[PDB]
C-alpha cells in the first residue's frame, strides 16, 4: 500500500545517495566506529526525535562530516548523520552511526490525520510492509554491500538489540 | 497509488515543518523577496538538480538562513532553501524562494527500476495524482495560509510561468 512507496522513497531519496559515500565519511572522522549505518525500524512507528533520551545507554557522540549536493533546485542540500556510543553496565561497548527510519513517522502521522485515509489499526502492517520492501530493495542494491543494517523490533532493551548486531 | 503516500510524506516530513517558520526566515534575510515558497511540479517528472541551467532567466542568488532540528535520531538535520531571481528581457523582474517537488524524482526513478512495479507510462498519471493530493492537503492545512504556491506544468518558458504567479 503506502509503505511500498515510502520504502522506495527512502532508497531513492537517501540511502542510494549516502551509502556509496558513507565509508569515505567514516574514515575522514577517524582522522572505533563501525563501518555500517544502523537503521532502527520500530514496528509500532514510535519514532522519537531525541534518541539519547529514548535509552540512557545510547549516547550522542558526534556528527559525521556533512555530505552536500544540489537537489531539485536547492543549493547544497545537507545530509548529516550522528554517531552514538552504546553502553552496557557503565562500559562503552560499541560505537556506530545510528538512526531511525524517518518514513515510519509519516506512517504514524498519516494514521492520525483523517484526510489521509489510513486507519490507526493499519500502522503495524504498513511498518512490516515497509521493512519487507526496504529489505528486498537493499538485498539487491549495488550501493549496499555491507554498508548498512536494518534493525526491526517490536516493543512489548534497545541498546542491547543494537549491541547484538554490532557483536561480530 | 504511490503518489498519495509521497504527497503525504512531502507534507508531513517537510512542508508542515518549514512553512510555519518560512516568513520568519525571509524577514531575517531582509536584514524584495516574495513571502511564499514556490514549488515547481513538472508533470513529466523531469526534475533537474541545477535549476539555473534549466532556464537562463532563472538565477541563484542566495540561501535563506538554515532551519535545524533533531529528527528521527539525527542531530541537527538541516532544512535549507534557495532564493532565485527571475529575469525577463535582461531585467530583474522577481525574486523568490523556489524549488522542485523532489518526490517527483522518486516517481521518475521508480519508473526506471524494474523491481518497483511501476511502468514508465504511469509517470504522468502519478504526477497528476501527486499534484492533486498535495493541493487537497494544502487547501486545508493550518501551516499553509499564503505561505506557498504550487506551480504545476507540462512542457510540450519556466521563468514566465513563475513570473505570472508572482504578478500580484
Ligand atoms: N538529509 C536527510 N537526513 C535524513 N534523512 C533523509 C535526508 N534526506 C532524505 N532523507 C530520507 O529519505 C526520504 C525521502 O527523501 P526525499 O528527498 O525523496 O523522508 C525522507 C527521509 O527519510
Ligand atoms: N532538507 C530537505 N530539503 C528539501 N526537501 C526535504 C528536506 N527534508 C525533507 N524534504 C522533503 O520531504 C520529503 C520526505 O522527507 P522525510 O524526512 O519524511 O523526500 C522528502 C523531501 O521531498
Swiss-Prot record, chains A, B:
Residues annotated to bind 3',3'-c-di-GMP: 9, 14, 77-80, 102
Reported tissue expression: Ubiquitously expressed. Expressed in skin endothelial cells, alveolar type 2 pneumocytes, bronchial epithelium and alveolar macrophages.
Mutagenesis / variant outcome for changing residue 99 to A: Strong decrease in c-di-GMP and cGAMP-binding
Effect of residue 79 to A: Abolished cGAMP-binding
Residues that bear Phosphothreonine: 68
Cytoplasmic side: 1-168
Effect of residue 123 to S: Found in a 9-month-old patient who died following a fever and severe neck abscess without indication of any severe bacterial infection; likely pathogenic; may affect splicing; constitutively active mutant that promotes the production of type I interferon in absence of cyclic dinucleotide ligand; localizes to the perinuclear region in absence of cyclic dinucleotide ligand
UniProt-annotated binding residues for 2',3'-cGAMP: 9, 14, 77, 102
Gene Ontology CC entries for this record: autophagosome; autophagosome membrane; ciliary basal body; cilium; cytoplasmic vesicle membrane; cytosol; endoplasmic reticulum membrane; endoplasmic reticulum-Golgi intermediate compartment membrane
Result of changing residue 102 to A: Strong decrease in c-di-GMP-binding
Glycyl lysine isopeptide (Lys-Gly) (interchain with G-Cter in ubiquitin) crosslink residues: 75
Region (Cyclic dinucleotide-binding domain (CBD)): 1-168
Keyword NAD: no
Effect of residue 77 to A: Abolished cGAMP-binding. Abolished ability to induce autophagy
Biological role stated in the UniProt entry: Facilitator of innate immune signaling that acts as a sensor of cytosolic DNA from bacteria and viruses and promotes the production of type I interferon (IFN-alpha and IFN-beta). Innate immune response is triggered in response to non-CpG double-stranded DNA from viruses and bacteria delivered to the cytoplasm. Acts by binding cyclic dinucleotides: recognizes and binds cyclic di-GMP (c-di-GMP), a second messenger produced by bacteria, cyclic UMP-AMP (2',3'-cUAMP), and cyclic GMP-AMP (cGAMP), a messenger produced by CGAS in response to DNA virus in the cytosol.
Protein family membership: Belongs to the STING family.
Disease: STING-associated vasculopathy, infantile-onset: An autoinflammatory disease characterized by early-onset systemic inflammation and cutaneous vasculopathy, resulting in severe skin lesions. Violaceous, scaling lesions of fingers, toes, nose, cheeks and ears progress to acral necrosis in most of the patients. Some patients have severe interstitial lung disease.
Domain description: In absence of cGAMP, the transmembrane and cytoplasmic regions interact to form an integrated, domain-swapped dimeric assembly. In absence of cyclic nucleotide (c-di-GMP or cGAMP), the protein is autoinhibited by an intramolecular interaction between the cyclic dinucleotide-binding domain (CBD) and the C-terminal tail (CTT). Following cGAMP-binding, the cyclic dinucleotide-binding domain (CBD) is closed, leading to a 180 degrees rotation of the CBD domain relative to the transmembrane domain. The pLxIS motif constitutes an IRF3-binding motif: following phosphorylation by TBK1, the phosphorylated pLxIS motif of STING1 recruits IRF3. IRF3 is then phosphorylated and activated by TBK1 to induce type-I interferons and other cytokines.
Protein's name according to its UniProt entry: Stimulator of interferon genes protein
Taxonomic source organism: Homo sapiens
Gene: STING1
Span of the entire protein shown here: 154 to 335 of 379
